[PDB]
Amino acid sequence: VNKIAQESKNIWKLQRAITILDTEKSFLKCMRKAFRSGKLLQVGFTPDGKDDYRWCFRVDEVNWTTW
Amino acid sequence: GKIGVLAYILQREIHEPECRHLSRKFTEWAYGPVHSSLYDLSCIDTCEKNSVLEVIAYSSSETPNRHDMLLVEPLNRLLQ
Amino acid sequence: KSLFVDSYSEILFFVQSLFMLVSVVLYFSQRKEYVASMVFSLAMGWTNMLYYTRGFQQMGIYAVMIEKMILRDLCRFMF
Amino acid sequence: SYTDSYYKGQTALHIAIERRNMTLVTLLVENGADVQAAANGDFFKKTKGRPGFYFGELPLSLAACTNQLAIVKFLLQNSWQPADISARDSVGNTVLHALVEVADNTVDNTKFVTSMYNEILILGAKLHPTLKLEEITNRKGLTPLALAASSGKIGVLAYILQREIHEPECRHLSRKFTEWAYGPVHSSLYDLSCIDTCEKNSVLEVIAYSSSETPNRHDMLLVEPLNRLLQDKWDRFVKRIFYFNFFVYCLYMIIFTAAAYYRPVEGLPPYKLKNTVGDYFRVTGEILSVSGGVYFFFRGIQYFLQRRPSLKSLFVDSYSEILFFVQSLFMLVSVVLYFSQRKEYVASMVFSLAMGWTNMLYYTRGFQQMGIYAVMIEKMILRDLCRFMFVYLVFLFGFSTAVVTLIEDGKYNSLYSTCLELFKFTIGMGDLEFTENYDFKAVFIILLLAYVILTYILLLNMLIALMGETVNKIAQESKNIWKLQRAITILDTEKSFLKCMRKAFRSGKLLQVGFTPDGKDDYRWCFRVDEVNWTTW
Amino acid sequence: VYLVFLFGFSTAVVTLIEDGKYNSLYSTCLELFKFTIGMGDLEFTENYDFKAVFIILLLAYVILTYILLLNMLIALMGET
Amino acid sequence: YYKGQTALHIAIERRNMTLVTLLVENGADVQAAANGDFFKKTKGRPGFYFGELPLSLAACTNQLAIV
Ligand SMILES: CCCCCCCCCCCCC(=O)O[C@@H](COC(=O)CCC)COP(=O)(O)O[C@H]1[C@H](O)[C@@H](O)[C@@H](O)[C@@H](O)[C@@H]1O
Ligand SMILES: CCCCCCCCCCCCC(=O)O[C@@H](COC(=O)CCC)COP(=O)(O)O[C@H]1[C@H](O)[C@@H](O)[C@@H](O)[C@@H](O)[C@@H]1O
Ligand SMILES: CCCCCCCCCCCCCCCC(=O)O[C@H](COC(=O)CCCCCC)COP(=O)(O)OCCN
Ligand SMILES: CCCCCCCCCCCCCCCC(=O)O[C@H](COC(=O)CCCCCC)COP(=O)(O)OCCN
């Protein structure tokens, strides 16, 4: 137990990930909300003039350095 | 199981013209200390065959770092 | 090899159901040993209730530690 | 400015400060930009779960919060329109309230918030010497110090409580002073205003009676003045008052034990009082037992009324009040069943007696080693015993149901008896051949051996291992929780006090420097702390 | 702490017991001490009413002392 | 409490070499015993024991030059 703390946390997270994937693959109702991110415009400027929407996921962060 | 390369790719951010579209991490806006990152999730959440979540989770148990790969930031936050 | 060294929960739930079906077969075969199969299925199912400790961080991590204790320390000790 | 509800009130000055453009700020202030505009859109409010950033809604607070000393200096000291340093937002927060609010106790955050707090206060003293800036209360009635204490901002509280400012015309802002010096030794004086008592939001009251969601409620009492202050109050009077209370509770439990032990064995109470000495003592003991139960009942009611826990803070926290209250509830139910002519008053009474003797562990606080030990017992019960009992009871019920299913037509074949027999393995008394009323002996013994391996060999030894990890990891947390428990005891003892004690203050009206903004001499009820430093001769 | 718990639950149990062989603080204290050495009977008497109260008291004693305090003693001796 | 404290003791206390030299030039008693209770043990009262003598004060204050 002194040595399997982080290993057990990671293995639990993997088990819950397998549960999540099984739940979303079974799903029994043809629900589209499992697509989890929403279609945002990242840059809107590819090498050509077209715009790129890439289903991004928002993560807010705070830093007190590199103002 | 190349956790180093996966950790590089999933939060890749390239700051130069004509290459920002290659990035997979974007900063939409930034106040003084606060700023909101955006991770790509193409080929992560769902795709044709080889979603990274499905590839990691349904690995064959001989992958080196399968337990630790889901700790890479967008994967852990997406699963939560 | 991955059928046994990994995915223990699927194997345990499958074996629970196998005991249930063998119990049904012995029940309709006019054998009292259906009670033996039934009680093994019942005990295994109640122990397989530990599967659902995932989804709770503290109980899930505790269950994972139980798994690793069984595989590493209890196995060496029991040998 | 913007009229959108998300960014309502945002001027170009807010953007200029945000972009860290000093020249644009100077040009905007030159052209008459309002330096007290309230940016109060929904983006700039609290509720961090939404996207947003709160800074106090004002550009001076924005410049302070973004670590821009030049812009706050300019906005306060520009030639066109100086900014009111005592300006207030919709919450009533000033610049210092905003600096307290934005803190998150990280090292860089603590550094910049400390420096900006110091500079803003110094500039406030210079521009407004008569202003008591830190006494301004927001709409919740909290000063910046009380806000820091209530929100768990240990980084800012730890700075404020031992603040030293040495500049002339600014030493009155200090809260730590030095009365005298010698060679290695010097005697420090701490301000102590709004710490021991101010009737509104004293820092000890704010920390101790926090709602358990404060991040650092256990760590905040480790700062230099508060720990010595609580130890001083303890050794002054609360040690004696607490030990008297412990003695009285011991007498109460001894009397209750004696009265319950010699209960009449005849049926159907109330019991006629036989004219003999022993029964007179018995009736006196019973009366005192019920009296003490009523006392603890009303104490628990007073606790719940004075605090009003919000339906979860009375289960995650304050376990002792609940336990003493339940003890008194069992006592009162015992009285009701006694006078209702029911024998079940013995059941209520024995639960009260057992719970009271276990509640004797409450008084281990006030003794450091026993108090820390009792805190560790609490944490074991909440974390390791709870997880263990969940998994253990699942295994026990599963194997008991399997075994009692296997058993047919015996003295066993009730679920309770089989559960008890399987439980006997845990206490080292399992028979392992407690019945033969079955067919399939191999199935019976396989079930019992599997139960033994999964519970007795595995889970109990795993519980020992996990408790080992816990004691390895909860040492400092246990000491901090013990100190918080003793602090709560100190505050309750001071607020009870039973004789109108005048000695609420610690160490006299010492003169710190005697140089106020005016010529008057300020007395602050200081607290003395003698310190020795061999460096800095 | 153990003697406080032992005396408390012994007083509760002997209060519950009426007109029996044990029915005394010494005998009940000894019977509750026997749980510590792995010899507690758990049905040492039936001279009471309210079997549920008796067994609840004994199980609470067992959990608070044998399962908790002894294993905690092992853990704290490990730390020491 | 400050009984027996001479000007030499204050001069050593303030780390002023010049004042110590001037006082010793003016016949200051280099064996004066500061018998005040502020310069003794029993720390329940504030103080600092140093052996009561200017030489011991100089040694105890890391003033090697004055020693
Ligand atoms: C008669 C009665 C007999 C009962 C006997 C059995 C008692 C135990 C019952 C416990 C039931 C709990 C459970 O459901 O099974 C536990 C396994 O516990 C054991 O060790 C059993 C040893 C045999 C978790 O198995 P899991 O499916 O989560 O496997 C993990 C993957 O998911 C994950 O991705 C990783 O690859 C990870 O490395 C894998 O392990
Ligand atoms: C039939 C008989 C059953 C008896 C069962 C119970 C046995 C233990 C009885 C022990 C009595 C000692 C006591 O009085 O209770 C212990 C709690 O022990 C338990 O875990 C009981 C679980 C129920 C201390 O509770 P405390 O008031 O100190 O709460 C702490 C705050 O003070 C502090 O500020 C912090 O916020 C901290 O986070 C809080 O927790
Ligand atoms: C750490 C926990 C360990 C568990 C230990 C075993 C107790 C759990 C029992 C759960 C199974 C369901 C109980 C059903 C109660 C009941 O209805 O059974 C009653 C027994 O009544 C009681 O003692 C109530 C017990 C109160 C429970 C206090 C936790 C009657 O039949 P008897 O065979 O006993 O007497 C028959 C005489 N010919
Ligand atoms: C870790 C501690 C574990 C506690 C173990 C139990 C002991 C605690 C007893 C406390 C209750 C008060 C004792 C009262 C003594 C007494 O008066 O009881 C006497 C027996 O006296 C003694 O053995 C003295 C015991 C010495 C105590 C050595 C620690 C006789 O009654 P019996 O029912 O036994 O015999 C009756 C035959 N007709």
mmCIF file with all atom_site columns, N, CA and C in Angstrom, chain D residues 257 260-261 263 343-344 347 350 357 361 373 376-377 381 385 416 420 423 426-429 464 467-468 471-472, chain E residues 1 4 7-8 11-12 15-16 18 24 38 40 42-43 50 53 55 59 62 66-69 72 74-76 79:
data_model
loop_
_atom_site.group_PDB
_atom_site.id
_atom_site.type_symbol
_atom_site.label_atom_id
_atom_site.label_alt_id
_atom_site.label_comp_id
_atom_site.label_asym_id
_atom_site.label_entity_id
_atom_site.label_seq_id
_atom_site.pdbx_PDB_ins_code
_atom_site.Cartn_x
_atom_site.Cartn_y
_atom_site.Cartn_z
_atom_site.occupancy
_atom_site.B_iso_or_equiv
_atom_site.pdbx_formal_charge
_atom_site.auth_seq_id
_atom_site.auth_comp_id
_atom_site.auth_asym_id
_atom_site.auth_atom_id
_atom_site.pdbx_PDB_model_num
ATOM 1   N N  . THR D 1 257 ? -23.656 5.398   35.972 1.00 0.00 ? 257 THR D N  1
ATOM 2   C CA . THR D 1 257 ? -23.285 3.990   35.978 1.00 0.00 ? 257 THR D CA 1
ATOM 3   C C  . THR D 1 257 ? -23.791 3.299   37.234 1.00 0.00 ? 257 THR D C  1
ATOM 4   N N  . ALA D 1 260 ? -27.738 3.081   37.096 1.00 0.00 ? 260 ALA D N  1
ATOM 5   C CA . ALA D 1 260 ? -28.234 2.109   36.131 1.00 0.00 ? 260 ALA D CA 1
ATOM 6   C C  . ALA D 1 260 ? -27.871 0.690   36.542 1.00 0.00 ? 260 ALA D C  1
ATOM 7   N N  . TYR D 1 261 ? -26.702 0.512   37.163 1.00 0.00 ? 261 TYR D N  1
ATOM 8   C CA . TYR D 1 261 ? -26.258 -0.815  37.573 1.00 0.00 ? 261 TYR D CA 1
ATOM 9   C C  . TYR D 1 261 ? -27.202 -1.429  38.596 1.00 0.00 ? 261 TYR D C  1
ATOM 10  N N  . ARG D 1 263 ? -30.397 -0.889  39.061 1.00 0.00 ? 263 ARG D N  1
ATOM 11  C CA . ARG D 1 263 ? -31.796 -0.697  38.725 1.00 0.00 ? 263 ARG D CA 1
ATOM 12  C C  . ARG D 1 263 ? -32.628 -1.827  39.341 1.00 0.00 ? 263 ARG D C  1
ATOM 13  N N  . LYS D 1 343 ? -40.671 -1.766  29.607 1.00 0.00 ? 343 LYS D N  1
ATOM 14  C CA . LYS D 1 343 ? -39.339 -2.264  30.033 1.00 0.00 ? 343 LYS D CA 1
ATOM 15  C C  . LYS D 1 343 ? -38.257 -1.738  29.083 1.00 0.00 ? 343 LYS D C  1
ATOM 16  N N  . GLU D 1 344 ? -38.631 -1.256  27.890 1.00 0.00 ? 344 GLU D N  1
ATOM 17  C CA . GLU D 1 344 ? -37.636 -0.824  26.909 1.00 0.00 ? 344 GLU D CA 1
ATOM 18  C C  . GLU D 1 344 ? -36.833 0.396   27.360 1.00 0.00 ? 344 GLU D C  1
ATOM 19  N N  . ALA D 1 347 ? -33.336 -0.571  27.489 1.00 0.00 ? 347 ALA D N  1
ATOM 20  C CA . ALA D 1 347 ? -32.644 -0.495  26.206 1.00 0.00 ? 347 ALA D CA 1
ATOM 21  C C  . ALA D 1 347 ? -32.164 0.923   25.917 1.00 0.00 ? 347 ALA D C  1
ATOM 22  N N  . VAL D 1 350 ? -29.278 1.811   28.431 1.00 0.00 ? 350 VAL D N  1
ATOM 23  C CA . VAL D 1 350 ? -27.967 1.204   28.214 1.00 0.00 ? 350 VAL D CA 1
ATOM 24  C C  . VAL D 1 350 ? -27.310 1.791   26.977 1.00 0.00 ? 350 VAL D C  1
ATOM 25  N N  . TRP D 1 357 ? -20.087 6.817   27.975 1.00 0.00 ? 357 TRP D N  1
ATOM 26  C CA . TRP D 1 357 ? -18.732 6.396   28.303 1.00 0.00 ? 357 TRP D CA 1
ATOM 27  C C  . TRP D 1 357 ? -17.813 6.499   27.093 1.00 0.00 ? 357 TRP D C  1
ATOM 28  N N  . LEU D 1 361 ? -14.256 10.137  25.540 1.00 0.00 ? 361 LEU D N  1
ATOM 29  C CA . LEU D 1 361 ? -13.126 10.418  24.664 1.00 0.00 ? 361 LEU D CA 1
ATOM 30  C C  . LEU D 1 361 ? -13.089 11.864  24.175 1.00 0.00 ? 361 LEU D C  1
ATOM 31  N N  . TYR D 1 373 ? -4.299  11.451  19.453 1.00 0.00 ? 373 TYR D N  1
ATOM 32  C CA . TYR D 1 373 ? -4.709  10.058  19.315 1.00 0.00 ? 373 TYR D CA 1
ATOM 33  C C  . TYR D 1 373 ? -6.202  9.948   19.028 1.00 0.00 ? 373 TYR D C  1
ATOM 34  N N  . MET D 1 376 ? -6.872  10.904  15.501 1.00 0.00 ? 376 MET D N  1
ATOM 35  C CA . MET D 1 376 ? -6.565  9.803   14.601 1.00 0.00 ? 376 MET D CA 1
ATOM 36  C C  . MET D 1 376 ? -7.640  8.725   14.654 1.00 0.00 ? 376 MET D C  1
ATOM 37  N N  . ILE D 1 377 ? -8.234  8.480   15.826 1.00 0.00 ? 377 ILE D N  1
ATOM 38  C CA . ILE D 1 377 ? -9.336  7.518   15.925 1.00 0.00 ? 377 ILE D CA 1
ATOM 39  C C  . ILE D 1 377 ? -10.512 7.974   15.068 1.00 0.00 ? 377 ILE D C  1
ATOM 40  N N  . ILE D 1 381 ? -12.065 5.962   11.786 1.00 0.00 ? 381 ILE D N  1
ATOM 41  C CA . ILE D 1 381 ? -13.478 5.604   11.688 1.00 0.00 ? 381 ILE D CA 1
ATOM 42  C C  . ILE D 1 381 ? -14.065 6.142   10.392 1.00 0.00 ? 381 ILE D C  1
ATOM 43  N N  . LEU D 1 385 ? -12.256 2.442   8.394  1.00 0.00 ? 385 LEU D N  1
ATOM 44  C CA . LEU D 1 385 ? -13.303 1.565   8.887  1.00 0.00 ? 385 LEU D CA 1
ATOM 45  C C  . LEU D 1 385 ? -14.539 1.649   8.006  1.00 0.00 ? 385 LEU D C  1
ATOM 46  N N  . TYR D 1 416 ? -29.996 -14.667 10.215 1.00 0.00 ? 416 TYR D N  1
ATOM 47  C CA . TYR D 1 416 ? -29.308 -14.041 11.338 1.00 0.00 ? 416 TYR D CA 1
ATOM 48  C C  . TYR D 1 416 ? -28.273 -14.973 11.956 1.00 0.00 ? 416 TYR D C  1
ATOM 49  N N  . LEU D 1 420 ? -24.262 -14.413 12.023 1.00 0.00 ? 420 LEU D N  1
ATOM 50  C CA . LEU D 1 420 ? -23.502 -14.354 13.267 1.00 0.00 ? 420 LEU D CA 1
ATOM 51  C C  . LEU D 1 420 ? -22.359 -15.362 13.262 1.00 0.00 ? 420 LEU D C  1
ATOM 52  N N  . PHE D 1 423 ? -19.699 -14.088 11.121 1.00 0.00 ? 423 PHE D N  1
ATOM 53  C CA . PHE D 1 423 ? -19.041 -12.974 11.793 1.00 0.00 ? 423 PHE D CA 1
ATOM 54  C C  . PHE D 1 423 ? -18.039 -13.467 12.824 1.00 0.00 ? 423 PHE D C  1
ATOM 55  N N  . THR D 1 426 ? -14.364 -13.363 12.078 1.00 0.00 ? 426 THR D N  1
ATOM 56  C CA . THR D 1 426 ? -13.649 -12.095 12.166 1.00 0.00 ? 426 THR D CA 1
ATOM 57  C C  . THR D 1 426 ? -13.025 -11.896 13.538 1.00 0.00 ? 426 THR D C  1
ATOM 58  N N  . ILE D 1 427 ? -13.702 -12.336 14.594 1.00 0.00 ? 427 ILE D N  1
ATOM 59  C CA . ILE D 1 427 ? -13.214 -12.178 15.958 1.00 0.00 ? 427 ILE D CA 1
ATOM 60  C C  . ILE D 1 427 ? -12.384 -13.385 16.408 1.00 0.00 ? 427 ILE D C  1
ATOM 61  N N  . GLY D 1 428 ? -11.947 -14.230 15.480 1.00 0.00 ? 428 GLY D N  1
ATOM 62  C CA . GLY D 1 428 ? -11.105 -15.352 15.844 1.00 0.00 ? 428 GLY D CA 1
ATOM 63  C C  . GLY D 1 428 ? -11.815 -16.446 16.601 1.00 0.00 ? 428 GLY D C  1
ATOM 64  N N  . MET D 1 429 ? -13.124 -16.616 16.374 1.00 0.00 ? 429 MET D N  1
ATOM 65  C CA . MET D 1 429 ? -13.938 -17.613 17.063 1.00 0.00 ? 429 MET D CA 1
ATOM 66  C C  . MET D 1 429 ? -14.815 -18.416 16.104 1.00 0.00 ? 429 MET D C  1
ATOM 67  N N  . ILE D 1 464 ? -5.223  -3.306  8.338  1.00 0.00 ? 464 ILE D N  1
ATOM 68  C CA . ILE D 1 464 ? -4.044  -2.932  9.119  1.00 0.00 ? 464 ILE D CA 1
ATOM 69  C C  . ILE D 1 464 ? -3.056  -2.162  8.246  1.00 0.00 ? 464 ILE D C  1
ATOM 70  N N  . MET D 1 467 ? -4.507  1.392   7.511  1.00 0.00 ? 467 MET D N  1
ATOM 71  C CA . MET D 1 467 ? -4.363  2.224   8.695  1.00 0.00 ? 467 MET D CA 1
ATOM 72  C C  . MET D 1 467 ? -2.908  2.616   8.913  1.00 0.00 ? 467 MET D C  1
ATOM 73  N N  . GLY D 1 468 ? -1.967  1.737   8.562  1.00 0.00 ? 468 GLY D N  1
ATOM 74  C CA . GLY D 1 468 ? -0.563  2.114   8.610  1.00 0.00 ? 468 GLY D CA 1
ATOM 75  C C  . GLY D 1 468 ? -0.230  3.253   7.664  1.00 0.00 ? 468 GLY D C  1
ATOM 76  N N  . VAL D 1 471 ? -1.869  6.533   9.262  1.00 0.00 ? 471 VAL D N  1
ATOM 77  C CA . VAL D 1 471 ? -1.072  7.126   10.340 1.00 0.00 ? 471 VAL D CA 1
ATOM 78  C C  . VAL D 1 471 ? 0.235   7.682   9.805  1.00 0.00 ? 471 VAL D C  1
ATOM 79  N N  . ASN D 1 472 ? 0.790   7.068   8.759  1.00 0.00 ? 472 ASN D N  1
ATOM 80  C CA . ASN D 1 472 ? 1.972   7.650   8.145  1.00 0.00 ? 472 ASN D CA 1
ATOM 81  C C  . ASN D 1 472 ? 1.676   9.006   7.522  1.00 0.00 ? 472 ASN D C  1
ATOM 82  N N  . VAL E 2 1   ? -7.738  4.467   26.208 1.00 0.00 ? 1   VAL E N  1
ATOM 83  C CA . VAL E 2 1   ? -8.958  4.511   25.407 1.00 0.00 ? 1   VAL E CA 1
ATOM 84  C C  . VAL E 2 1   ? -9.676  3.166   25.443 1.00 0.00 ? 1   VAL E C  1
ATOM 85  N N  . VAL E 2 4   ? -11.479 2.675   28.721 1.00 0.00 ? 4   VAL E N  1
ATOM 86  C CA . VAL E 2 4   ? -12.690 3.492   28.755 1.00 0.00 ? 4   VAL E CA 1
ATOM 87  C C  . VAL E 2 4   ? -13.810 2.806   27.977 1.00 0.00 ? 4   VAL E C  1
ATOM 88  N N  . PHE E 2 7   ? -14.926 -0.479  29.892 1.00 0.00 ? 7   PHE E N  1
ATOM 89  C CA . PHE E 2 7   ? -15.754 -0.194  31.054 1.00 0.00 ? 7   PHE E CA 1
ATOM 90  C C  . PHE E 2 7   ? -17.125 0.315   30.640 1.00 0.00 ? 7   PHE E C  1
ATOM 91  N N  . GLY E 2 8   ? -17.183 1.153   29.602 1.00 0.00 ? 8   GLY E N  1
ATOM 92  C CA . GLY E 2 8   ? -18.469 1.653   29.143 1.00 0.00 ? 8   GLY E CA 1
ATOM 93  C C  . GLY E 2 8   ? -19.391 0.553   28.658 1.00 0.00 ? 8   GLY E C  1
ATOM 94  N N  . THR E 2 11  ? -20.434 -1.855  31.474 1.00 0.00 ? 11  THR E N  1
ATOM 95  C CA . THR E 2 11  ? -21.494 -1.325  32.320 1.00 0.00 ? 11  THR E CA 1
ATOM 96  C C  . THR E 2 11  ? -22.833 -1.378  31.602 1.00 0.00 ? 11  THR E C  1
ATOM 97  N N  . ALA E 2 12  ? -22.845 -1.070  30.303 1.00 0.00 ? 12  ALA E N  1
ATOM 98  C CA . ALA E 2 12  ? -24.087 -1.171  29.541 1.00 0.00 ? 12  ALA E CA 1
ATOM 99  C C  . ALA E 2 12  ? -24.598 -2.607  29.493 1.00 0.00 ? 12  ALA E C  1
ATOM 100 N N  . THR E 2 15  ? -25.772 -3.835  32.877 1.00 0.00 ? 15  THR E N  1
ATOM 101 C CA . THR E 2 15  ? -27.064 -3.219  33.140 1.00 0.00 ? 15  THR E CA 1
ATOM 102 C C  . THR E 2 15  ? -28.173 -3.947  32.397 1.00 0.00 ? 15  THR E C  1
ATOM 103 N N  . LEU E 2 16  ? -27.915 -4.345  31.151 1.00 0.00 ? 16  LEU E N  1
ATOM 104 C CA . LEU E 2 16  ? -28.926 -5.076  30.397 1.00 0.00 ? 16  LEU E CA 1
ATOM 105 C C  . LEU E 2 16  ? -29.191 -6.449  31.004 1.00 0.00 ? 16  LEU E C  1
ATOM 106 N N  . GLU E 2 18  ? -29.982 -9.239  33.616 1.00 0.00 ? 18  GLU E N  1
ATOM 107 C CA . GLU E 2 18  ? -30.765 -9.253  34.846 1.00 0.00 ? 18  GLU E CA 1
ATOM 108 C C  . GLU E 2 18  ? -30.918 -10.682 35.340 1.00 0.00 ? 18  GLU E C  1
ATOM 109 N N  . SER E 2 24  ? -22.772 -9.002  36.922 1.00 0.00 ? 24  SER E N  1
ATOM 110 C CA . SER E 2 24  ? -21.802 -8.395  37.814 1.00 0.00 ? 24  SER E CA 1
ATOM 111 C C  . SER E 2 24  ? -20.734 -7.757  36.954 1.00 0.00 ? 24  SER E C  1
ATOM 112 N N  . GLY E 2 38  ? -9.330  -12.739 21.221 1.00 0.00 ? 38  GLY E N  1
ATOM 113 C CA . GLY E 2 38  ? -9.875  -13.662 20.248 1.00 0.00 ? 38  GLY E CA 1
ATOM 114 C C  . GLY E 2 38  ? -10.614 -14.834 20.847 1.00 0.00 ? 38  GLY E C  1
ATOM 115 N N  . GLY E 2 40  ? -13.878 -14.067 22.617 1.00 0.00 ? 40  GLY E N  1
ATOM 116 C CA . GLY E 2 40  ? -15.186 -13.578 23.019 1.00 0.00 ? 40  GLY E CA 1
ATOM 117 C C  . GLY E 2 40  ? -16.288 -14.468 22.483 1.00 0.00 ? 40  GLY E C  1
ATOM 118 N N  . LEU E 2 42  ? -19.694 -14.049 22.348 1.00 0.00 ? 42  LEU E N  1
ATOM 119 C CA . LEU E 2 42  ? -20.717 -13.301 21.608 1.00 0.00 ? 42  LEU E CA 1
ATOM 120 C C  . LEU E 2 42  ? -22.141 -13.792 21.867 1.00 0.00 ? 42  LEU E C  1
ATOM 121 N N  . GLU E 2 43  ? -22.310 -14.889 22.607 1.00 0.00 ? 43  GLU E N  1
ATOM 122 C CA . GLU E 2 43  ? -23.601 -15.325 23.119 1.00 0.00 ? 43  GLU E CA 1
ATOM 123 C C  . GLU E 2 43  ? -23.432 -15.895 24.516 1.00 0.00 ? 43  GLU E C  1
ATOM 124 N N  . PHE E 2 50  ? -34.605 -8.123  25.283 1.00 0.00 ? 50  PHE E N  1
ATOM 125 C CA . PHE E 2 50  ? -34.058 -7.278  24.220 1.00 0.00 ? 50  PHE E CA 1
ATOM 126 C C  . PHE E 2 50  ? -32.738 -7.850  23.686 1.00 0.00 ? 50  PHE E C  1
ATOM 127 N N  . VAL E 2 53  ? -30.747 -5.412  21.523 1.00 0.00 ? 53  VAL E N  1
ATOM 128 C CA . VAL E 2 53  ? -29.940 -4.432  22.242 1.00 0.00 ? 53  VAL E CA 1
ATOM 129 C C  . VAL E 2 53  ? -28.626 -5.059  22.690 1.00 0.00 ? 53  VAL E C  1
ATOM 130 N N  . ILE E 2 55  ? -26.992 -7.704  21.356 1.00 0.00 ? 55  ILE E N  1
ATOM 131 C CA . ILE E 2 55  ? -26.088 -7.995  20.251 1.00 0.00 ? 55  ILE E CA 1
ATOM 132 C C  . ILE E 2 55  ? -25.590 -6.705  19.611 1.00 0.00 ? 55  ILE E C  1
ATOM 133 N N  . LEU E 2 59  ? -21.673 -5.994  19.261 1.00 0.00 ? 59  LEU E N  1
ATOM 134 C CA . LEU E 2 59  ? -21.090 -5.720  17.953 1.00 0.00 ? 59  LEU E CA 1
ATOM 135 C C  . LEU E 2 59  ? -20.455 -4.340  17.905 1.00 0.00 ? 59  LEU E C  1
ATOM 136 N N  . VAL E 2 62  ? -17.235 -4.658  19.672 1.00 0.00 ? 62  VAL E N  1
ATOM 137 C CA . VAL E 2 62  ? -16.284 -5.395  18.846 1.00 0.00 ? 62  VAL E CA 1
ATOM 138 C C  . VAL E 2 62  ? -15.698 -4.486  17.777 1.00 0.00 ? 62  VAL E C  1
ATOM 139 N N  . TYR E 2 66  ? -11.970 -4.272  18.894 1.00 0.00 ? 66  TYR E N  1
ATOM 140 C CA . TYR E 2 66  ? -11.177 -5.318  18.260 1.00 0.00 ? 66  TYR E CA 1
ATOM 141 C C  . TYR E 2 66  ? -10.780 -4.936  16.839 1.00 0.00 ? 66  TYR E C  1
ATOM 142 N N  . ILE E 2 67  ? -11.736 -4.481  16.030 1.00 0.00 ? 67  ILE E N  1
ATOM 143 C CA . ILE E 2 67  ? -11.427 -4.169  14.639 1.00 0.00 ? 67  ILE E CA 1
ATOM 144 C C  . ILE E 2 67  ? -10.659 -2.859  14.538 1.00 0.00 ? 67  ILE E C  1
ATOM 145 N N  . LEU E 2 68  ? -11.040 -1.858  15.328 1.00 0.00 ? 68  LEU E N  1
ATOM 146 C CA . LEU E 2 68  ? -10.491 -0.516  15.175 1.00 0.00 ? 68  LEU E CA 1
ATOM 147 C C  . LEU E 2 68  ? -9.254  -0.289  16.040 1.00 0.00 ? 68  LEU E C  1
ATOM 148 N N  . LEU E 2 69  ? -9.381  -0.420  17.362 1.00 0.00 ? 69  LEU E N  1
ATOM 149 C CA . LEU E 2 69  ? -8.319  0.055   18.242 1.00 0.00 ? 69  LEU E CA 1
ATOM 150 C C  . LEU E 2 69  ? -7.088  -0.839  18.183 1.00 0.00 ? 69  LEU E C  1
ATOM 151 N N  . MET E 2 72  ? -5.389  -0.176  14.947 1.00 0.00 ? 72  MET E N  1
ATOM 152 C CA . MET E 2 72  ? -4.798  1.147   15.055 1.00 0.00 ? 72  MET E CA 1
ATOM 153 C C  . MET E 2 72  ? -3.547  1.116   15.917 1.00 0.00 ? 72  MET E C  1
ATOM 154 N N  . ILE E 2 74  ? -1.528  -1.418  16.059 1.00 0.00 ? 74  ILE E N  1
ATOM 155 C CA . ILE E 2 74  ? -0.508  -1.983  15.177 1.00 0.00 ? 74  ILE E CA 1
ATOM 156 C C  . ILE E 2 74  ? 0.029   -0.905  14.238 1.00 0.00 ? 74  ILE E C  1
ATOM 157 N N  . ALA E 2 75  ? -0.870  -0.093  13.678 1.00 0.00 ? 75  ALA E N  1
ATOM 158 C CA . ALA E 2 75  ? -0.455  0.975   12.773 1.00 0.00 ? 75  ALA E CA 1
ATOM 159 C C  . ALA E 2 75  ? 0.411   2.013   13.480 1.00 0.00 ? 75  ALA E C  1
ATOM 160 N N  . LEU E 2 76  ? 0.036   2.394   14.699 1.00 0.00 ? 76  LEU E N  1
ATOM 161 C CA . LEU E 2 76  ? 0.786   3.421   15.410 1.00 0.00 ? 76  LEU E CA 1
ATOM 162 C C  . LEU E 2 76  ? 2.122   2.892   15.894 1.00 0.00 ? 76  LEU E C  1
ATOM 163 N N  . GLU E 2 79  ? 4.281   3.243   12.936 1.00 0.00 ? 79  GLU E N  1
ATOM 164 C CA . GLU E 2 79  ? 4.779   4.608   12.795 1.00 0.00 ? 79  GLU E CA 1
ATOM 165 C C  . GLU E 2 79  ? 5.875   4.903   13.816 1.00 0.00 ? 79  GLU E C  1
#
